[PDB]
UniProtKB/Swiss-Prot annotation, chains A, B, C, D, E, F:
One of its GO terms (molecular function) is ATP binding. Transmembrane segments: none annotated. GO terms for biological process: plasmid maintenance. Coiled coil: none annotated. Pfam families: AAA_25 (PF13481). This protein is involved in regulating the plasmid copy-number. Increasing the level of this protein results in a higher plasmid copy-number. InterPro entries: P-loop_NTPase, RepA. The gene is repA. It comes from the Bacteria. Keywords: ATP-binding, Nucleotide-binding, Plasmid, Plasmid copy control. This is Regulatory protein RepA.
Length: 254, 254, 254, 254, 254, 254
């Protein structure tokens, strides 16, 4: 990506247009990450945010977000599993909403395709796939490079190429990560399953905490504070705002 | 392999067909692993599951599984040893069951052949061998690559190529591994010899524990929970269900 | 860069010209660093210092500094965020001061441009951009090389190239670094958000410490001591002196 | 090496031919190791075992073994030391036995020859020398490769090449190793000088333990258990059975 | 460099000429090192010893040293800083002594030049610069190579090249090093700022210890023991003998 | 080096000639090492053994050793230092002995010559220099290679080349080492300065233990036991048998 010098006098003289956020606290045209241990629900959450930006409803009740074409690249899930996940989500959408989602969302399975962003063929293809789009989701980062995720140099190159695509096309990029990488990212969100401790704190008996997960923004530079959110895992894993009440007075001794 | 974009509206519109499992909790067309310390019985278990999927009887009493051509690639055992294991297993099969196994199972010894999936010759050969088959078993992974199993980058490439073959041919791949690879695998099963503590728990005298092993699925993303299984080692190591009874009231002080 | 041998006799007889400092304690024509944890305010401080040297006012109350052309290279901030930062700073500048800054400061966004000082094309371009200039700011170092920052050999080459550019052109270079690498630098400054301990030491009640940050020179070889400074964070993050006084007697028990 | 698929039906119907052991518990046509600290007596034991298989007497009292041509490759001992070792062993052989050994054993000194199994010239030469032979002994492994023995990738290739030679020619390969690397071997034997604790356990007074060494198979997959053996060190280092008996009641307090 | 065989009979027959020392305990035509933490005063001490060997006075009161052409190569200090140090030193030299120093000392700044002794261009240039000279000072070693100072192999090559230049030209080489290299060096001297404990030992008030430094030889193979020296820091850092008296009876309790 | 197969029948039928030792317990035609911390006296001891094998007297009173041409390669000492060392030693030799030493000993200084045995030019030269000789001494190993002495692979190559030279030419090679390497060597000797503890044990008062050093063979496979020897350091470092008496009854409390 190449940029023209900033017009300093203009920036001083007039108020610049408000920042454009693709996601809460994430500026459009940049790279971000969604992290959590495997199985926490990143793929489901990612699909839901993708569907919302594509034009679907705000089922997650995060802020209302601008709409634009979205491309989701799942490289770890078998296609038939994705079918089932979409069918499950579909139960939460009206006929008009299902249509809007299909009109703005592209899902291209890449399991076994071996994408390597450090290879010209894939960098070129990914950049072309980002053109005209507002968001690109990579699930997960591990399958889009062949470097050591512990090597700062190689990873600075891998992440740098995502920044190049985003800056040149305007299409934001969010990669999922099972868990440095975070040091090279300016926006980071996460998923954290409800712990036994949190279960007691929110009046959820153990045995049931398996159905709740919290989401928040762990790293951001701009925008108003985004409060952590609790989601309930419905049939098929679909996430929806949880209805929970703080257990001010303990039920026993935590 | 290459995939067609997901038809979103169709996925929403009607429930997709049920998932096709090659093994308990493992989706057909993906890669999985069977792990345990050396000498625990992976080769015998693998041969039995292979014989089952090939069309043989469900001697292991694990779930009922779809049948299809199977290719077993033992790269560490002397060919004559494989003959002894087959002969032992044969004593548990009727005439028609032996014919069934023979018609659907191919066993190609590779000791001394040095297969290297990162080499074009072997990748192409292994992919060709997977064509038209339901399952391919690699025994063990160590002899199918020349990388440092501690290196995430190189191993991501090795496992990645197995995913390419499985997704492209539809043939599932399961590799054995002597006790990371777990991080890059979505399905994982294991074998663990009966401990002295477990022997006490199941009323099995110590010294006799050497004849029992437990089999379970430690990592799976889809499907109903698979209950751990206890197997009894018979002549030649052939595995059978074993009917153990948990000692409710201990025989003494464990 | 090339230097002429030192004329010994002349150095003895003539009074050495006063050292030319681009920044407090930093000799013009050398490389230096501004260090701090991400989010402490390096980008804002650097911008204000750059505006001052370019010809703007001494808003920070640091020593008056020689003026000269300045080029600021932000490689991590999206252009729109820079527009906003400039507009905020502009509220502290008169019409004449705004023009002075615009006349002497050049800001070239590099997000996604992937600069690599070890690559001929980039070394040449950066060297070319340093010609005729007083100061060049790299924000941050991590985005100007693809090496391991903990590797002395590689970083010697990276830092060495910045030294070559500064020496040959006369343009000083200051790179930002998010909290080894300081062992290769002769000038280092830092930013440190006020801690609870420091707030009690300076008469700032807790809950208000979020408004203050300290700036100081942690490594220098020449010049009179630069006293640590406390800055108050104003709208948009603009830093202003806001003088504090030491709390001789504690307000309680620290 | 190349193998023919296993004829399943035949393996079921026909009784598998008895496993052919080159050494106790070691299947002919595979790779194995003899391990111990330097100086324990590996070279002498290996020479005696080699002489036996070549057609000499069973001086060691191990199981009678099939006879066949043997090639011994000492890469660490100067030729003159080998002459002396042979002369010492000769005192235990009759005229007819000496001739049998000379007829079936080939000893090619390689000290200073710098064999490297990873080099085409040496892999080809060693493979050629294994043709038509029953056993090939490498003394010791360290002098047949230039890799890091603690590096799994490189050693996989080194050991893999020995497996290829053994499988293709039918000639078993046993390499000596001075006390990871055993994880890649299926057969392992050892030598261990009698310790003070073992001497008291076997009725040997201290000060005499220097005369005894124990031999045993530490890793094996097939065959009836081989009982650990105690050998007495005679002139020149020649090993002979010398049977000991367990000391039921201690001679004091161990 | 190339050497003629030693004439043994001649060496036996008569006592060889006395050893030629370039510095205390350091034989002419070899490599040595001056080590200390950064900021201890190595550059000033080095310049003074250089000025002495060049023909200046023995201000340091170290042994009397043979005179000869000297070349000083400071690669980290801005040229203008060197002018200030020379000017300060000049105040301690008479008119004739200044001329003496100027006639025998060459100072070639190399900041930003990036000398790399492993590169043919620089090795050849440095060797040419050593021709006809008595001493060459490298300040500091870090800027004369691009290797990992932790790597024994590469450093053995770097130091080796310095030995080649010294042995071939006869010009001794001393490199400064900010606190392995010691293992590959036969002569090593150091600087260590006065500790609070040492201050007490020499009746120097704390807070004033900052003006004293001790110089010594930590590694030397030949010559009479060199006694540690205490130096007083004067204006501009110029070093002078300092006449300290050891406090026999302590002033209080150390 | 290449060797003809061993004539087995001949080795059995007749007693082979006694082993030829170049040094106590070291077989001629092999590689050995002399190790000790720097400054212990390896260079002096090495020169003395070299002079003895060359034809000089057994000043060290080790065993009487066969004579043959010797070449000593000092790569760390300045030539003039070697002159002084030889002159010192000369004081202990008669005119006839000095002549014998000069007739059989060649000393070729290599300081700054940068020998690299892994380079064709140097391997070829060293091998040529070993032809017709009985012993070659390298002082020290570090200066004859550019590898990491901690890397077993590279070192196996470096040492292997010395074995190649020795085996092909018959010239033994002993390298000195300041202190793995020892694991690759079959003969090792050492020097150990007298400790305060040893001083008391041999009735040597402290302050004087600096004049005594012990020598022994730490690793050997053949020959009769070699008892550790105590040497006294005379003028110039020349070593001679020390006249010491065990302090059976302590002088106080050790």
């Amino acid at each position: 990506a190449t940029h023209k010098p900033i017009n300093i006098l203009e920036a001083f003289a007039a108020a610049p247009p408000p920042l454009d956020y693709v996601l809460p606290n994430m500026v459009a045209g940049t790279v971000g990450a969604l992290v959590s241990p495997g199985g926490a629900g990143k793929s489901m959450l990612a699909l839901q945010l993708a569907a919302q930006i594509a034009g679907g409803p705000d089922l997650l009740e995060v802020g209302e977000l601008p709409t634009g074409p979205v491309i989701y690249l799942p490289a770890e899930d078998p296609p038939t599993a994705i079918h089932h996940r979409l069918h499950a989500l579909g139960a939460h959408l009206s006929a008009e909403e299902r249509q809007a989602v299909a009109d703005g969302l592209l899902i291209q399975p890449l399991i076994g395709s071996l994408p390597n962003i450090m290879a010209p063929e894939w960098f070129d293809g990914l950049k072309r796939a980002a053109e005209g789009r507002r968001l690109m989701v990579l699930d997960t980062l591990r399958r889009f490079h062949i470097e050591e995720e512990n090597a700062s140099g190689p990873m600075a190159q891998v992440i740098g190429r995502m920044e190049a695509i985003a800056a040149d096309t305007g299409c934001s990029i969010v990669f999922l990560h099972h868990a440095v990488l975070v040091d090279n990212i300016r926006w980071q969100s996460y998923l954290s399953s409800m712990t036994s401790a949190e279960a007691e704190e929110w009046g959820v008996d153990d045995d049931q905490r398996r159905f709740f997960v919290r989401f928040g923004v762990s790293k951001a530079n701009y925008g108003a504070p985004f409060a952590d959110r609790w989601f309930r895992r419905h049939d098929g894993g679909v996430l929806k705002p949880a209805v929970l009440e703080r257990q001010r007075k303990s039920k026993g001794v935590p």
